[PDB]
Amino acid sequence: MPAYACQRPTPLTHHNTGLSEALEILAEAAGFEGSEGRLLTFCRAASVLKALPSPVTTLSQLQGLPHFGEHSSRVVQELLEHGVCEEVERVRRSERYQTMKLFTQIFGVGVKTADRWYREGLRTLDDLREQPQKLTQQQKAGLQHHQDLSTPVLRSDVDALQQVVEEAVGQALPGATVTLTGGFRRGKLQGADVDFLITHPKEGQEAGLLPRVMCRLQDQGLILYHQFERSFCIFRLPQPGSWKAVRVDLVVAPVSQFPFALLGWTGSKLFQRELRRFSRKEKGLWLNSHGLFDPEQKTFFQAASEEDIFRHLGLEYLPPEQRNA
DNA sequence: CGGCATACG
DNA sequence: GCCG
Ligand SMILES: [Cl-]
Ligand SMILES: [Cl-]
Ligand SMILES: [Cl-]
Ligand SMILES: [Cl-]
Ligand SMILES: [Mg+2]
Ligand code: NA
Ligand code: NA
C-alpha cells in the first residue's frame, strides 16, 4: 500500500465504510479545533481503508499500512471489538462538534467564524437569524437558503443545470464548452453542489467570459445569489410545481490550462492535496490548477490531457472514479 | 524535529 | 497524528 493517495486507486464505494466514517469524524473534529495536522492524518488513514480490497476484520491487518499508528489503530480496534469507538461517540454527542458542524455547513461561514459564534454562546440557526446585522450578505444568503442547500443534489438535477449553463455559455461565447467536474465527475449519484469548468478551443477567447455568462444567467432569473475566474452561485432549479436552491460553481480556464484545471476541479479534495504534496516532495515539481512548474529549469509543463499530467509525475493514470480518496 | 496543497473572491 |  503506497503512502500517497494519488498512488493508489480509491473507488467511490468500498469495503470499510464504517471504519473510514469513524476516522473522518475525528478528522472533522480536529479541523474544528484548528489542528490541520491531525485532520490530515485521520483523513489519510480513512482513505487507506477505502483503498483496501476487502474488509479489515482483525487488528493485525493494519500492520504495515501507512498512516496507522497508535491512535487510528486503537479507533479501529474498538470498532472491531465493540462496534463503536468511545472517543468517536463522545465527539458525535458533544455540543461543540454539533454546533461547529451546523455553523460551518452554512455558505459564508468557516471554522474561524463558527468558533467565534460558539464562544459568544450562539448555538442555533435561529440564534443567527435574530441578529442579522452581524452577518455578511453571503452569510445571509447561506442562511436563507440553508434548508434547500442541505437537500442532496441528484444526477437528474445535474443534467438540467448543465443544459441551462450551456445555453448561457453559448450566447456569451459561441464555441465555448462546459465540462462537469467535481464529485459528479468521480461518479457520485448525489452531492451538495455542482461544479462546471468552461473553456474555449481558441486560446485567449475565454478572457472576460464569466461576467458575460453570469449576466445572462441572471437575466434569465436563474440566479438567487452570486458575488474573475470562479463564481460561487446559488441557482434557482425548477422542481415539480416549484423550485429549489442549488449551489453551483462555475470556473473558466484557458484551453492551454484546461487539463490542469480539470484535474484540479475533479478532486477529491484529499486526492488533490496528496497529488500536490507528491509532486513537490517526491518529484520536485510545483502543481496547481493552472500548471506544473519545474523550479530548476524554470519551465512549465505543457499538458494536452490529464493522462499527460500523470505521466509527467511518474504516476499510473487514475480515472476520476478512482480518485475518491 | 518539520511538514502538512494551493489557489481565487 | 503520523512520516521521513
Ligand atoms: Cl462540547
Ligand atoms: Cl420557477
Ligand atoms: Cl515554460
Ligand atoms: Cl490552484
Ligand atoms: Mg463539488
Ligand atoms: Na461554510
Ligand atoms: Na463546488
Domain total in chain A: 4
DSSP H or E run through A48: helix A36-50
- Among protein residues, the one whose C-alpha sits closest to the C1' atom of C1 is A38
Task: Find out whether A226 and A130 touch, Cβ atoms under 8 Å.
Answer: no
- Please tell me whether residues A121 and A28 are part of one structural domain: no
Task: Find out whether A301 and A312 touch, Cβ atoms under 8 Å.
Answer: yes
- Compute the distance between CA of residue A196 and CA of residue A230 in angstroms, rounded to an integer: 10
Beta carbons within 10 angstroms of residue A121's beta carbon: 7
Domain boundary among A209, A231, A255: A255
CA A55 – C1' B7 distance (Å)?
A: 37
CA A316 – C1' C3 distance (Å)?
A: 23
**CATH code of the domain in which A145 resides:** 1.10.150.20
| Cα three-residue angle A230-A224-A153, rounded to 5 degrees | 75
**Among the listed residues A162, A202, A209, the one whose alpha carbon sits nearest the alpha carbon of residue A185:** A162
Domain boundary among A62, A94, A126: A94
**CATH code of the domain in which A221 resides:** 3.30.460.10
- Please tell me whether residues A266 and A312 are part of one structural domain: yes
Residue A238 CA to ligand 2 center (angstroms) comes to 5
Task: Find out whether A172 and A212 touch, Cβ atoms under 8 Å.
Answer: yes
Q: Is residue A317's beta carbon less than 7 angstroms from any atom in nucleic acid strand B?
A: no
- Please tell me whether residues A229 and A270 are part of one structural domain: no
Q: Could you say which nucleotides of strand C lie within 7 A of any protein CB atom? A: 1-4
User: What is the domain extent for residue A131?
Assistant: 95-151
Could you tell me which residues come within 8 angstroms of residue A17 by beta carbon, excluding any fewer than 6 positions away? none
Residue ranges of E strands in chain A: 153-154, 177-180, 190-191, 193-199, 223-225, 230-239, 242-252, 286-288, 291-294, 299-300
- Please tell me whether residues A242 and A318 are part of one structural domain: no
- Please tell me whether residues A112 and A147 are part of one structural domain: yes
Residue A24 CA to ligand 4 center (angstroms) comes to 24
- Please tell me whether residues A215 and A250 are part of one structural domain: yes
Cell match 478551443: residue? A201
Residue A211 CA to ligand 4 center (angstroms) comes to 21
Task: Find out whether A59 and A77 touch, Cβ atoms under 8 Å.
Answer: yes
Task: Find out whether A271 and A323 touch, Cβ atoms under 8 Å.
Answer: yes
- Compute the distance between CA of residue A188 and CA of residue A310 in angstroms, rounded to an integer: 23
Q: Is residue A277's beta carbon less than 7 angstroms from any atom in nucleic acid strand C?
A: no
Q: Is A126 a catalytic residue?
A: no
**CATH code of the domain in which A282 resides:** 3.30.210.10
- Resolution of the experimental model in angstroms, please? 1.9
Under DSSP, is residue A233 helix (H, G, I), strand (E, B) or coil?
A: strand
**Among the listed residues A195, A202, A198, the one whose alpha carbon sits nearest the alpha carbon of residue A232:** A195
Cell match 442579522: residue? A132
A148 annotated as a binding-site residue? no
- Please tell me whether residues A118 and A208 are part of one structural domain: no
Number of H helices, E strands in chain A: 15, 10
Sign of the dihedral defined by the CA atoms of residues A235, A236, A238, A242, in that order: positive
- Please tell me whether residues A142 and A195 are part of one structural domain: no
- Which one-letter amino acid corresponds to residue A21? E
- Which one-letter amino acid corresponds to residue A117? W
- Compute the distance between CA of residue A318 and CA of residue A298 in angstroms, rounded to an integer: 28
Domain boundary among A151, A186, A217: A151
- CB burial of A264-302 (b: ≥16 within 10 Å; e: otherwise) equals bbbbbebbbbbbbebbeeeeebebebebbbeeeeeeebe
- Which one-letter amino acid corresponds to residue A204? G
Question: DSSP per residue over A11-33, as a string?
Answer: -SS-S-HHHHHHHHHHHHHHHHT
**Among the listed residues A248, A269, A266, the one whose alpha carbon sits nearest the alpha carbon of residue A258:** A266
DSSP H or E run through A209: helix A209-219
- Please tell me whether residues A157 and A242 are part of one structural domain: yes
Cell match 460551518: residue? A104
- Please tell me whether residues A158 and A100 are part of one structural domain: no
Which nucleotide lies at the shortest CA–C1' distance from A288?
B6
Cell match 465527539: residue? A91
Q: Is A294 a catalytic residue?
A: no
A195 annotated as a binding-site residue? yes
Which nucleotide lies at the shortest CA–C1' distance from A229?
B8
CA A66 – C1' C2 distance (Å)?
A: 9
Cell match 509532486: residue? A279
- Please tell me whether residues A158 and A247 are part of one structural domain: yes
- Please tell me whether residues A225 and A273 are part of one structural domain: no
Task: Find out whether A108 and A45 touch, Cβ atoms under 8 Å.
Answer: no
Which nucleotide lies at the shortest CA–C1' distance from A281?
B3
